[PDB]
A = this chain, B = another copy of it.
Amino acid sequence: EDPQLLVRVRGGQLRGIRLKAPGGPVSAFLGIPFAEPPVGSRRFMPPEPKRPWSGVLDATTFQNVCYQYVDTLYPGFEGTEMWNPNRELSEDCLYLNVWTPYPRPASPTPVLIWIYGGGFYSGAASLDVYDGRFLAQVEGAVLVSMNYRVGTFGFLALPGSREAPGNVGLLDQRLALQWVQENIAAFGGDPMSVTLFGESAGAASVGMHILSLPSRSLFHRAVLQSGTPNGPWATVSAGEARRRATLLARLVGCNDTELIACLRTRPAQDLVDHEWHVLPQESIFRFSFVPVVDGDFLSDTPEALINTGDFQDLQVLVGVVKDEGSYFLVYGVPGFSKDNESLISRAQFLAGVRIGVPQASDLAAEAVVLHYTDWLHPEDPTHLRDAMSAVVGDHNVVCPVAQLAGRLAAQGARVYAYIFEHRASTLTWPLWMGVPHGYEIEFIFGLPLDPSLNYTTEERIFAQRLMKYWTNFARTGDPNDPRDSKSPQWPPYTTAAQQYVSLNLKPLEVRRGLRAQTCAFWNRFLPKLLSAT
């Protein structure tokens, strides 16, 4: 009976488990409930705080994954399976996990809260790549991660209605944040030093907590990895949210009250089965149910809020991987596949752009094609394929990120920017995809320190650097070592110098302008093109 593995939170007692990490043991408390199960009548509803419990609750295993669509494009393929649920699915899923060093921290410790991604339709805190044992052991951090409702269960909304107000998936996150404030001190964590970090839909979520005032009192620093609250995919309007909900209802056999009633009486899979068939266009990087501009959680559009927000005492770390768009091409764009080199014609390229940019008018689409064409080699299938990836990557991530970083820096925020350019030696996706969306994560969480995963010895050294950057940023709001000299230093991103760094096997290198001319095209011109048409 290890007293290190025993903790009293406000809801009662927990029994953690001692886990072996390469450099030593860590105390893990997995599967802690922070909310009443959002089941039956609580479907589509805001989460309620967990009722106290008797005795000692067993917090030694990962709990269920929020009911969600499971990918099927490449059954058995490791590259896809690493993102699929690794526990049983259930609407009863609102549990969070906690890692601390072993022994428990003597002094109050910085808290890292991970918010996973998955297009707001998938994901789980129990995936191996989110294993928080390495950060807790090496950097002496307290890591926290929560499940939150995805898909219809988390973001289906009939705006203005009482029984489906929307954004409950975000409120799931917010409640887990409140839990950390109220309870993390018992784990040796410092609630006055909470750093949110997430990836993809997770990064966008972190961003929405930045833009929602009630959330702001629950953290001190933020990290957005390859995702933003602004951009074409992270949010929908109230009108469009109301449209998709009513269509899904129709697709399953269903006054707002009475319509949501019928949906509550439907097996979880019946909703998921029709989840993807409510999208207005054929598209990639588009997600049926996502956060909504409701005037509540989001008082206005993210664009509006980032444009007029005071970010005076905020510190943020943002970045992208080298190939943000490649992953999405094999999931809808004809000509692409993980199994060949996906060399495409110029014709396929024009077609894919209508899919990568479902919003674009004919003129706007052609403007994209003409901008991304290599007029020295306009027919070269390699360039066209690599260009199709860039259109998607830049439209959906890089330039949304560049825009956000610009607005934040300009309006008083402290900003550090990176680009991640190392491809894992263990990667199973083809070489033409390069460094796909999501594959910085395993390095930040320090999995290469696990010798069994067959990572190269250089990657282990690389992973330790990144863990240092992230945790130094968590401790201080500055990823730079307060002990290291020549390197050189990671400088703040500013609207003037626009400096960012490259994260790879080679030392930090400072560059300037994050695809500036291309993002000028996406962020300044094309909007004018659909604001006149």
Which residues of A line the B interface, CB within 8 A? Answer: 363, 366-367, 370, 373, 375-376, 498, 512-513, 516-517, 520-521, 524-525, 528-529, 532-533
By a CB distance below 8 angstroms, the chain B residues around A373 are: 517, 520
Complex CA–CA separation, A525 to B369 (angstroms): 10
Contact of A370 among B512, B524, B532, B533 (CB under 8 A): B524
By a CB distance below 8 angstroms, the chain B residues around A367 are: 525
Q: Which residue of B lies closest to A363 (CB)?
A: B532
Minimum CB–CB distance from A505 to chain B (whole Å) comes to: 27
By a CB distance below 8 angstroms, the chain B residues around A525 are: 366-367, 370
**Known interface pairs A370-B521, A370-B525, A525-B366; A375-B532 also in contact (CB < 8 Å):** no
Complex CA–CA separation, A516 to B376 (angstroms): 7
By a CB distance below 8 angstroms, the chain B residues around A528 are: 363, 366
Minimum CB–CB distance from A494 to chain B (whole Å) comes to: 12
By a CB distance below 8 angstroms, the chain B residues around A370 are: 520-521, 524-525
Could you list 19 A-B pairs, sorted by A, with CB under 8 Å?
A: A363-B528, A363-B529, A366-B525, A366-B528, A367-B525, A370-B520, A370-B524, A370-B525, A373-B517, A373-B520, A375-B513, A375-B516, A375-B517, A375-B520, A376-B498, A376-B512, A376-B513, A376-B516, A532-B533
Complex CA–CA separation, A512 to B376 (angstroms): 8
Q: Which residue of B lies closest to A516 (CB)?
A: B375
What's the number of copies of this chain in the assembled complex? 2
Main secondary structure of the interface of A (DSSP, over half): helix
By a CB distance below 8 angstroms, the chain B residues around A520 are: 370, 373, 375
Complex CA–CA separation, A370 to B525 (angstroms): 7
Minimum CB–CB distance from A299 to chain B (whole Å) comes to: 30
Complex CA–CA separation, A532 to B364 (angstroms): 12
Complex CA–CA separation, A366 to B529 (angstroms): 11
Please give me the 10 A-B residue pairs with the lowest Cβ-Cβ distance, nearest first: A375-B516, A376-B513, A375-B520, A370-B525, A376-B516, A370-B524, A363-B532, A370-B520, A375-B517, A376-B512
Minimum CB–CB distance from A36 to chain B (whole Å) comes to: 50
Complex CA–CA separation, A145 to B529 (angstroms): 50
By a CB distance below 8 angstroms, the chain B residues around A366 are: 525, 528
Complex CA–CA separation, A386 to B55 (angstroms): 76
Known: A366-B525, A373-B517. 15 other contacts (CB 8 A): A363-B528, A363-B529, A363-B532, A367-B525, A370-B520, A370-B521, A370-B525, A375-B513, A375-B517, A375-B520, A376-B498, A376-B512, A376-B513, A376-B516, A532-B533
Minimum CB–CB distance from A383 to chain B (whole Å) comes to: 13
Q: Which residue of B lies closest to A366 (CB)?
A: B528
Complex CA–CA separation, A525 to B368 (angstroms): 10
Q: Which residue of B lies closest to A375 (CB)?
A: B516
By a CB distance below 8 angstroms, the chain B residues around A512 are: 376
By a CB distance below 8 angstroms, the chain B residues around A376 are: 498, 512-513, 516
Minimum CB–CB distance from A511 to chain B (whole Å) comes to: 11
By a CB distance below 8 angstroms, the chain B residues around A521 are: 370
By a CB distance below 8 angstroms, the chain B residues around A375 are: 513, 516-517, 520
Q: Which residue of B lies closest to A379 (CB)?
A: B496
Complex CA–CA separation, A183 to B48 (angstroms): 103
Q: Which residue of B lies closest to A373 (CB)?
A: B520
Complex CA–CA separation, A366 to B528 (angstroms): 9
Which of A370, A375, A498 gathers most chain B CB within 10 Å? A375
Complex CA–CA separation, A90 to B212 (angstroms): 79
By a CB distance below 8 angstroms, the chain B residues around A524 are: 370
Minimum CB–CB distance from A300 to chain B (whole Å) comes to: 26
Minimum CB–CB distance from A30 to chain B (whole Å) comes to: 47
Complex CA–CA separation, A529 to B366 (angstroms): 11
By a CB distance below 8 angstroms, the chain B residues around A513 are: 375-376
